[PDB]
């Protein structure tokens, strides 16, 4: 029995030099992302709604136009909810489907259901339209480098449906898409034809982006088994800063701070985490002040912060994949 599922434990990044770091910083466009990937998502899109369908089409369209050989799959399922049985659709975008290992980036694309109030509509800009757009921008910015993937390791993007509770958060009313996908992936042999390893053994690391877009986020180092990757984010943020490649940024106000978090934050990584998948949870603590209010909109997004995080994440991925 091959020990390939243990490779993630020893995987090391291929660190980019200064010139490559400048190249990545210049290759991403916050204004392009804003207009082409983010604004079309700033709409009401709770599960089963017309907005959900439109968001899903937008995400797929933006990935399909890229040169890299992305394979798109829509994982549609039924679940009981406080409003009865409903349909949900997770979006999975994968390079090299039969590749044994994948670094996974994820976020949820649904928005919490709220009835309109005083003509205001909830669109969850940081929760999680921005993370969705950051993943789309990453696919676009690194497209040429990702095309060269067409170490049996590649990249996968997951956009979960139904992260939000239809009412208030509870064990049975929340995490619909991830509870479903995690169970499905855990019972799917991988690579095809495998005897005893699942798609979950193939997940090197799950990088879950959530609640990003507000000013001054501080991401804690939640888990000891991914702490060495959290440190890479810190190193990348530090070098991009020292090279003058970040905007309105200081080390005192750095995003990746040295600090554990006792508790546990319920989010889409939970069903994966509890089945042994290593997770790097990029959710800030505390949550954005506009969390779950009509003010979680475009107007309250911090543009240079998102731009800085796009550069950091893009360098993290290139270094992880050795690209
Ligand atoms: Zn939320």
């Amino acid at each position: 029995a091959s020990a390939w599922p243990e490779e993630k434990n020893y995987h090391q990044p291929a660190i980019l030099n200064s010139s490559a770091l400048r190249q990545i910083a210049e290759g991403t466009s916050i204004s392009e992302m804003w207009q082409n990937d983010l604004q079309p998502l700033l709409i009401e899109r709770y599960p089963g709604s017309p907005g959900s369908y439109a968001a899903r089409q937008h995400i797929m369209q933006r990935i399909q136009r890229l040169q890299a050989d992305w394979v798109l799959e829509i994982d549609t399922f039924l679940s009981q909810t406080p409003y009865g049985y409903r349909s949900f659709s997770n979006i999975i975008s994968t390079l090299n489907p039969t590749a044994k290992r994948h670094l996974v980036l994820a976020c949820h694309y649904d928005s919490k259901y709220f009835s309109h109030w005083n003509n205001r509509v909830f669109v969850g800009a940081t929760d999680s339209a921005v993370p969705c757009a950051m993943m789309l921008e990453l696919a676009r910015a690194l497209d040429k480098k990702l095309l060269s993937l067409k170490p049996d390791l590649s990249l996968q993007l997951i956009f979960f449906d139904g992260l939000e509770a239809f009412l208030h958060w509870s064990p049975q009313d929340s995490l619909y898409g991830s509870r479903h996908l995690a169970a499905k992936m855990a019972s799917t042999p991988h690579p095809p034809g495998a005897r005893g390893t699942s798609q979950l053994h193939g997940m090197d690391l799950l990088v879950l982006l959530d609640l990003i877009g507000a000013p001054n986020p501080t991401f804690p180092n939640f888990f000891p088994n991914s702490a060495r990757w959290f440190e890479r984010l810190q190193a990348i943020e530090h070098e991009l800063h020292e090279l003058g490649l970040l905007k309105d940024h200081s080390l005192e106000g750095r995003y990746f701070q040295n600090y554990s978090y006792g508790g546990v934050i319920q989010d889409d990584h939970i069903p994966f985490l509890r089945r042994g998948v290593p997770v790097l949870h990029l959710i800030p603590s505390p949550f954005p002040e506009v969390w779950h209010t009509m003010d979680d909109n475009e107007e309250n997004l911090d543009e240079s912060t998102i731009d800085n995080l796009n550069k950091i994440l893009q360098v993290f991925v290139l270094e992880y994949l050795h690209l």
Side-chain angles (χ1 to χ4, degrees):
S2 175
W4 73 263
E6 286 178 75
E7 298 182 3
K8 53 169 164 284
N9 302 121
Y10 308 99
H11 193 251
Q12 296 306 310
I15 295 154
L16 310 193
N17 60 28
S18 298
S19 156
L21 284 179
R22 304 190 189 95
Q23 184 203 86
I24 306 315
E26 292 290 315
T28 174
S29 170
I30 187 61
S31 70
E32 283 293 282
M33 181 196 97
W34 214 276
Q35 170 177 277
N36 305 320
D37 288 306
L38 179 69
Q39 285 175 338
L41 290 173
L42 292 174
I43 59 180
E44 172 168 38
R45 53 192 192 286
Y46 58 92
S49 66
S52 176
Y53 178 73
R56 190 158 60 249
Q57 303 304 303
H58 168 71
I59 287 164
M60 292 182 92
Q61 286 176 171
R62 296 291 293 172
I63 290 166
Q64 293 182 314
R65 63 185 290 283
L66 303 179
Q67 294 186 57
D69 197 11
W70 290 103
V71 174
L72 283 159
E73 297 170 288
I74 300 308
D75 162 45
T76 297
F77 62 100
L78 278 179
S79 175
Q80 165 65 125
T81 80
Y83 293 100
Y85 299 173
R86 288 180 79 86
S87 185
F88 295 79
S89 290
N90 290 317
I91 300 161
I92 298 95
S93 194
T94 310
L95 288 178
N96 309 276
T98 68
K100 291 204 299 310
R101 306 165 46 204
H102 288 81
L103 160 62
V104 187
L105 305 190
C107 74
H108 74 94
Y109 77 93
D110 63 309
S111 60
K112 185 169 179 57
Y113 172 71
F114 279 107
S115 77
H116 300 172
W117 184 90
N118 291 169
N119 291 302
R120 298 190 71 191
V121 176
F122 186 76
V123 301
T126 65
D127 187 12
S128 283
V130 164
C132 285
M134 296 172 68
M135 286 165 58
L136 294 179
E137 166 56 16
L138 178 145
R140 184 199 71 70
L142 310 177
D143 199 33
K144 187 179 180 183
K145 283 148 185 309
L146 290 172
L147 183 61
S148 72
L149 284 167
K150 183 173 176 173
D152 190 21
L153 170 70
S154 200
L155 184 66
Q156 176 172 253
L157 304 177
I158 299 172
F159 301 80
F160 297 105
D161 194 359
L163 170 282
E164 306 283 12
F166 275 94
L167 291 186
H168 246 309
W169 199 277
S170 77
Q172 311 77 16
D173 181 25
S174 63
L175 312 197
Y176 292 95
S178 48
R179 282 187 290 103
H180 169 81
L181 187 55
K184 181 166 169 184
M185 282 178 78
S187 61
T188 300
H190 184 73
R195 290 176 301 162
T197 53
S198 77
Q199 285 181 335
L200 286 207
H201 300 146
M203 298 189 51
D204 255 42
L205 178 74
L206 175 63
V207 184
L208 174 63
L209 279 51
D210 200 1
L211 310 184
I212 295 176
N216 313 304
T218 54
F219 300 97
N221 188 356
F222 297 99
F223 308 110
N225 69 5
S226 60
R228 71 195 182 90
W229 291 115
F230 180 91
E231 282 158 26
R232 283 304 312 153
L233 286 172
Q234 294 189 103
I236 290 171
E237 169 177 34
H238 181 95
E239 187 72 0
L240 287 179
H241 180 271
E242 294 295 305
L243 292 180
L245 298 177
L246 299 189
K247 174 80 175 178
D248 303 328
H249 179 276
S250 66
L251 295 182
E252 279 299 291
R254 58 187 183 293
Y255 313 131
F256 295 98
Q257 315 212 323
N258 328 60
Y259 87 96
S260 91
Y261 180 93
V264 37
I265 306 194
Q266 294 300 300
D267 204 335
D268 283 310
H269 64 298
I270 293 287
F272 289 92
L273 182 75
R274 301 203 181 311
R275 283 180 174 82
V277 178
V279 174
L280 190 51
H281 195 186
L282 309 184
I283 189 164
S285 193
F287 289 179
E289 291 176 36
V290 300
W291 180 84
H292 287 187
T293 64
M294 296 294 188
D295 294 326
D296 186 2
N297 58 25
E298 187 174 353
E299 173 197 314
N300 289 305
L301 296 180
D302 183 323
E303 184 180 292
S304 55
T305 295
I306 300 171
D307 191 29
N308 295 335
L309 290 163
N310 277 334
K311 298 175 174 175
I312 291 156
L313 181 66
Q314 286 171 27
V315 170
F316 178 90
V317 173
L318 291 176
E319 300 189 338
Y320 197 97
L321 298 178
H322 291 22
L323 293 182

